[PDB]
């Protein structure tokens, strides 16, 4: 999940 | 077990929302060769993909959002992303009657919309929405509140919790405060709040139409879609 | 004369315009199939539909609008109105949808029909919300009227007249909340909480229309020509 | 001639 990654980067 | 969002004053809510605003981005739109269905979709989805990155940063700056667990945050964004893009667009297009300001270097009017069959009716609704904000004098302070409502609200009922409704109430409180400060009468305040909240129903409608159109474009191989966008669509499910 | 009615008699006229609760012609002796359950739903809707049209005639301000406008409003709102009606009266049957007094379908029975479970879940969620807030029938009849008047107004001036009467119902909603004992800020909060549920109802309606449209092409069940006029105005 | 329009007239 790219969104999940961007959400915690 | 708390939220520094629930003890923000009105003013502090407005301040923190205004500063969290994403930048206006430009279209890598090359005006030296014609518009085609593919190429317009290309420019739009490209712009949507990069706006997305900033939307996420912004959401983490909406008071009370980062207090949610990731899995909730994910669901809300997944659920609201297109509504947020749409309302941003409509705001930018306010004092440009008849046109949509996707980017400072990308003003498209309704007829350009025909370049992609199935699109013009969504342009039509987006322009209707722009006129309505315009003729009801929407303010930036009200805009950033509406935008934060769409985020927290659009996914809250498909969580199959009260902290999200607590923050939503505190935004309602902020909206009223702004109206009273602008010198609206008590009942002008509650009328205007309703008029603004009722427009969110139509933005939700546009989002659903926009989602189905984007899905169509995908299933007809008219344009590639960044894996990010592809995952946004997938959260939704179409025929 | 609609702009000059009092909150009280705004409420009164609406409570009195309310459609009857219809029954399903479901036979508790022969079990479900996708096609029988859907047939039962679209039959029921075709009938509620003709009542709705009369109810809309009795919403204040409606017959002030051109017939061409009245059509457009009913065409956009109709399923949304159907759905809130369903959610309202399913309100105190936790976990189920009272489609008709003799047809209350549990979340599982949503599976008989492919793709319906999802729409069911959103409907029961909303019903779980109304109950949570303890929605009142006087508020309900306002929401419903608001949907009728709001849903199609931006896709048309009498837009103003419509907004003018939409403000009256807003006024009515708050009157009902003040009289119920809420502080000012509890009023504007509740009002907002109700109006935000209309966005979700809009969402369910958008989803319900795509599913209705798929059951139609696949010809799994026959729709009355009234329902199809209604459907086909949406695309 | 939509049946809706005729139901509204009646
Ligand atoms: C998703 C979309 C392309 C990208 C548009 C877009 C792109 C950038 C932006 O700032 C706003 C919008 C609003 C609508 C979006 C379209 C609706 C249907 C479609 O295919
Ligand atoms: C229109 C519908 C059938 C009829 C349902 C119906 C029928 C009667 C009623 O009081 C409420 C509802 C709510 C949902 C409606 C379905 C959604 C998808 C579909 O095909």
Give the distance, in angstroms, between the CA of residue B22 and the centroid of all CA atoms in the same chain: 12
Structural resolution in Å: 2.3
Contact C222, C100 (CB under 8 A): no
Which residues 129-158 of chain C have a CB within 8 Å of chain B? 129, 146, 150-151, 154-155
Q: Which residues contact C19 (CB under 8 A, 6 or more apart)?
A: C48, C51, C52, C54, C55, C85
Kindly determine whether residue B157 and residue C122, on different chains, have CB atoms separated by under 8 Å: yes
- Contact list in C for residue B160 (CB cut-off 8 A) is 121, 125
- Retrieve residue C179's tokens: 């009289």
Pairing of β B106-109 and β B99-103 = antiparallel
In this complex, is the C-beta atom of B56 within 8 Å of any C-beta atom belonging to chain A? yes
B79 burial via Cβ count (<10 Å: 0-12, 13-18, 19+): buried
Nearest-angstrom CA–CA distance, C146 and C150: 6
> Could you give the C-alpha distances from C40 to B186, B238, C53, C155, in angstroms and in order?
48, 25, 20, 32
Contact B53, A6 (CB under 8 A): yes
DSSP-H helix ranges across chain C: 7-15, 34-57, 67-89, 116-132, 137-150, 159-179, 184-217, 225-232
Q: At C144, phi and psi to the nearest 5?
A: -45, -50
Nearest-angstrom CA–CA distance, C49 and C220: 21
Q: Looking at the DSSP assignment, which residues form a beta bridge with residue C103?
A: C100
Question: How many domains does chain B divide into?
Answer: 1
DSSP category for residue C222 = P
Q: After which residues does a break in chain D occur, C–N more than 2.5 Å? A: none
Residue B162, number of CB atoms within 10 A of its CB: 7
Nearest-angstrom CA–CA distance, B229 and C24: 43
Nearest C-alpha neighbor of B167 from the set B77, B68, B91, B69: B68
**End-to-end Cα separation, chain B, in angstroms:** 42
Phi-psi region of C104 (alpha: psi -120 to 50; beta: other; left: phi over 0): beta
Q: Which domain holds residue B233?
A: 1-239
> Could you give the C-alpha distances from B184 to B176, B177, B188, B193, C79, in angstroms and in order?
9, 10, 6, 11, 36
Instruction: State which approach was used to obtain the coordinates.
Output: X-ray
C and D touch per CB criterion (3+ pairs under 8 A): yes
B22 burial via Cβ count (<10 Å: 0-12, 13-18, 19+): middle
- Contact list in D for residue C57 (CB cut-off 8 A) is 8
Nearest-angstrom CA–CA distance, C97 and C100: 9
- Contact list in B for residue C133 (CB cut-off 8 A) is none
In this complex, is the C-beta atom of D1 within 8 Å of any C-beta atom belonging to chain C? no
In this complex, is the C-beta atom of C47 within 8 Å of any C-beta atom belonging to chain D? no
Q: At C98, phi and psi to the nearest 5?
A: -85, 80
Among protein residues, the one with the nearest Cα to ligand 2's atom 2 is C212
DSSP B96-107: STTEEEEETTEE
CATH number at residue B45: 1.10.565.10
Kindly tell me the number of DSSP H helices and DSSP E strands found in chain B.
Answer: 8, 2
């Amino acid at each position: 999940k790219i969104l999940h990654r961007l959400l915690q980067d | 077990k708390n939220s520094l969002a629930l003890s923000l004053t009105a003013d502090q809510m407005v301040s923190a929302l205004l500063d969290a605003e994403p930048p206006i981005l430009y279209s890598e739109y090359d005006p030296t060769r014609p518009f085609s269905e593919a190429s317009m979709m290309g420019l739009l989805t490209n712009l949507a993909d990069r706006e997305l990155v900033h939307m996420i940063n912004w959401a983490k700056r909406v008071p009370g959002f980062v207090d949610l667990t990731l899995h909730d945050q994910v669901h809300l964004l997944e659920c609201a992303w297109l509504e947020i893009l749409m309302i941003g667009l409509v705001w930018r297009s306010m004092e440009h009657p008849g046109k949509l300001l996707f980017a400072p270097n990308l003003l498209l009017d309704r007829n350009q919309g025909k370049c992609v069959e199935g699109m013009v009716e969504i342009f039509d609704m987006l322009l209707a929405t722009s006129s309505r904000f315009r003729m009801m004098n929407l303010q930036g302070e009200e805009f950033v509140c509406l935008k934060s409502i769409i985020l927290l609200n659009s996914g809250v009922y498909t969580f199959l919790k009260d902290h999200i409704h607590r923050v939503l109430d505190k935004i309602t409180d902020t909206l009223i405060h702004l109206m009273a400060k602008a010198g609206l009468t008590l009942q002008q305040q509650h009328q205007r709040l309703a008029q603004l909240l009722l427009i969110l129903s139509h933005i939700r409608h546009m989002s659903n139409k926009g989602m189905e159109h984007l899905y169509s474009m995908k299933c007809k191989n008219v344009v590639p879609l960044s894996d990010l966008l592809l995952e946004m669509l997938d959260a939704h499910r179409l025929h």
